[PDB]
Amino acid sequence: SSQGLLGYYFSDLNFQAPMVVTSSTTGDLSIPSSELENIPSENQYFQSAIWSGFIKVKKSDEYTFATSADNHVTMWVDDQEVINKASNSNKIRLEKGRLYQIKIQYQRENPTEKGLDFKLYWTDSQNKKEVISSDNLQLPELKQKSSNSRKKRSTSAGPTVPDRDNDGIPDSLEVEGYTVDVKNKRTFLSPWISNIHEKKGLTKYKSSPEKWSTASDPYSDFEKVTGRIDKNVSPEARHPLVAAYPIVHVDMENIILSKNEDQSTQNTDSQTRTISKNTSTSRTHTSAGFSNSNSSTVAIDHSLSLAGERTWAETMGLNTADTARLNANIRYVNTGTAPIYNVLPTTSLVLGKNQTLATIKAKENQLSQILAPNNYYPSKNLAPIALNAQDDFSSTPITMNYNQFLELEKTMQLRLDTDQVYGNIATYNFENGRVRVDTGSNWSEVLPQIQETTARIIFNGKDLNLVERRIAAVNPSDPLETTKPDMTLKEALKIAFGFNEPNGNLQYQGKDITEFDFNFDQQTSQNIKNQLAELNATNIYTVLDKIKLNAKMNILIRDKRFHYDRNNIAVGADESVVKEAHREVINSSTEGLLLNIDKDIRKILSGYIVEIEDTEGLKEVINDRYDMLNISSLRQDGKTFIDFKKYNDKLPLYISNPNYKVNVYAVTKENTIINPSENGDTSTNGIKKILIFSKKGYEIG
Numbered sequence: 001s002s003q004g005l006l007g008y009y010f011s012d013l014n015f016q017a018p019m020v021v022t023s024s025t026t027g028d029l030s031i032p033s034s035e036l037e038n039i040p041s042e043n044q045y046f047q048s049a050i051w052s053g054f055i056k057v058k059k060s061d062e063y064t065f066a067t068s069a070d071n072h073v074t075m076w077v078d079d080q081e082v083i084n085k086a087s088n089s090n091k092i093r094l095e096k097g098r099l100y101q102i103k104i105q106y107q108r109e110n111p112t113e114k115g116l117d118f119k120l121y122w123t124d125s126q127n128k129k130e131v132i133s134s135d136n137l138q139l140p141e142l143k144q145k146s147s148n149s150r151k152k153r154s155t156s157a158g159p160t161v162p163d164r165d166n167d168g169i170p171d172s173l174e175v176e177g178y179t180v181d182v183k184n185k186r187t188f189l190s191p192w193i194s195n196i197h198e199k200k201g202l203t204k205y206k207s208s209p210e211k212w213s214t215a216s217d218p219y220s221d222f223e224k225v226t227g228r229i230d231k232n233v234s235p236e237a238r239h240p241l242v243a244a245y246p247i248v249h250v251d252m253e254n255i256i257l258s259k260n261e262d263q264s265t266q267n268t269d270s271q272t273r274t275i276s277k278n279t280s281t282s283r284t285h286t287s288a289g290f291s292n293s294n295s296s297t298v299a300i301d302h303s304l305s306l307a308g309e310r311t312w313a314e315t316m317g318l319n320t321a322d323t324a325r326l327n328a329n330i331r332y333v334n335t336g337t338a339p340i341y342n343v344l345p346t347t348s349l350v351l352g353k354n355q356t357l358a359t360i361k362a363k364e365n366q367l368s369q370i371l372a373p374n375n376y377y378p379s380k381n382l383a384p385i386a387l388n389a390q391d392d393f394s395s396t397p398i399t400m401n402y403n404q405f406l407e408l409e410k411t412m413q414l415r416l417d418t419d420q421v422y423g424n425i426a427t428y429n430f431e432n433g434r435v436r437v438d439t440g441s442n443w444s445e446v447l448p449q450i451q452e453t454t455a456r457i458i459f460n461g462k463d464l465n466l467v468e469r470r471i472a473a474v475n476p477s478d479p480l481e482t483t484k485p486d487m488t489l490k491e492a493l494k495i496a497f498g499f500n501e502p503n504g505n506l507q508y509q510g511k512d513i514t515e516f517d518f519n520f521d522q523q524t525s526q527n528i529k530n531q532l533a534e535l536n537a538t539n540i541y542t543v544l545d546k547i548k549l550n551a552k553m554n555i556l557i558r559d560k561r562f563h564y565d566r567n568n569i570a571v572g573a574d575e576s577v578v579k580e581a582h583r584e585v586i587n588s589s590t591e592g593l594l595l596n597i598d599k600d601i602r603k604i605l606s607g608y609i610v611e612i613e614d615t616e617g618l619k620e621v622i623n624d625r626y627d628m629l630n631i632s633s634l635r636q637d638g639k640t641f642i643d644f645k646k647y648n649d650k651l652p653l654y655i656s657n658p659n660y661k662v663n664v665y666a667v668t669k670e671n672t673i674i675n676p677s678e679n680g681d682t683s684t685n686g687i688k689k690i691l692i693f694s695k696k697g698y699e700i701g
């Protein structure tokens, strides 16, 4: 369906103004006027055309080639003229299982009909003539290298289509701007016209005529826009200016700690004394940063999960010479734009700033599924990976010594550093028109070039998680790079993140761009500052269309509502923001609160503190422990219930006097206490908390 001959249709007689670039499955190379909706009626007259590709014969014979316009045609087979402005009865021997280059040129001055009715025929020795079938035709080898059987360049005889990078799109089209128009059976590539295409809302593409892949990634500009590409590649990365490459980090879902057995203790019948905790993991970025690394930071839930208030050593019976080990459930996460097939990158589990506790590896070439973009390995419909799997004898115990154990208890955090080793790439093959994992193609050969020639934007508009995209961008100092189209900050956001302009105001999912901040690495900031000064602009938000991106820029764009830590994880928000987010009270009673809270807001809250304030201003805190804040839960209808009874010995609030108040406070992640105070205090005393509800007993009901 994606196979056949490649056709170039021109409105001039000398192959200079290409109007349509498309492919035909069979020897019918015709384009009826009905398919020329995206072309000015003036430009629907084709005075010249060129087709190229390959013919494969299934049975050796003497073949005579012909077209419907022999008098206007010159045709070459393997550099050999077989038709030249006249019908030829000349027969050529073709051998089964061999591939022959085809090149066909056509010229007709002042056509009276729009479009083109053109067919290519062959005749066998038995005198059977027919339009050359689809099984006998193949596309040209539009790659950076030849196949063993398919040469990547067409014959020198005759006119050479101008395709400096051999991606299939004519030089002039990549520079000037092109659109791709969907048909049922094929794709038309056509010059951009401002009046006709803008009204349609079609995408205007520009690419480098000297870069087979303009984003320096492993898919060609032509492959991208024609759909001759891995279906798992992200939609935005079908734009020639958006890089398609995997981005992987590890998500830890929960953890279990246990004392390591030792040679001195022959007793293995003791009661289980393990410590199990949920965890939350966020990919992180570490002014903006210029390093291309994959890391995530894990937050271990501090809420009490066991009876008593013992130390971990007390709970697990660890003496000072004992060691402990950790088992966790994880998934790999691809937040990039291309899938991973045969390799999962290697991960270090790190405690503190530099300690490494484990090296996490999967079996190469044994993956149970693809790791697709915006997806997980294993899929969320399947069980996660246990670091120590029950079906595997040889999982390395992830062991900590006593002091490391204490440090983990004291910090309640781990780090997962993941390398960028992603294995082989599924590429398109023009010989069979299918996508397959290619042993000859590897991500480690592409990533450095992608990193060197693109601008990086990291954006958290999607659920406050950091998502990185790379957009092809000029490097003034690199001549090859200069050819690529100017990339503006505005265009970048539209094509890479799906920002849209419904009212002429740039928005992401309904949020104006002004609801996000801009942060840059030191060099990018100085660059952007100079651009603004040159533009005489005081406000970046009003000149996004005029701010030009360059290769190696690093841009960080964050939701303004939130406070961010050094890892750019959202950890809090302004008091007024938090208070406003809690203004919609659906229901209140002595058992709790029912509210509609923004999903993003919920993300930065570690919990709630509930208190009764008597008439004299004194306060009874019902959930009086740092580790008892976890009293909120998300209902099925997306509403939040704050549970007064949970840490009130399962009893609703007793309010002695209707004039007393019930005050509820939110505690943000950055204000969360994770360990008892040095004084040993475990109360909520001193916890920075935000009042989000206060009603008297008689107001509550």
Ligand SMILES: [Ca+2]
Pocket: 162, 163, 164, 165, 166, 167, 168, 169, 170, 171, 174, 208, 209, 210
């Ligand atoms: Ca090209």
Ligand SMILES: [Ca+2]
Pocket: 165, 167, 174, 207, 208, 209, 210, 211, 212, 213, 214, 221
């Ligand atoms: Ca190109």
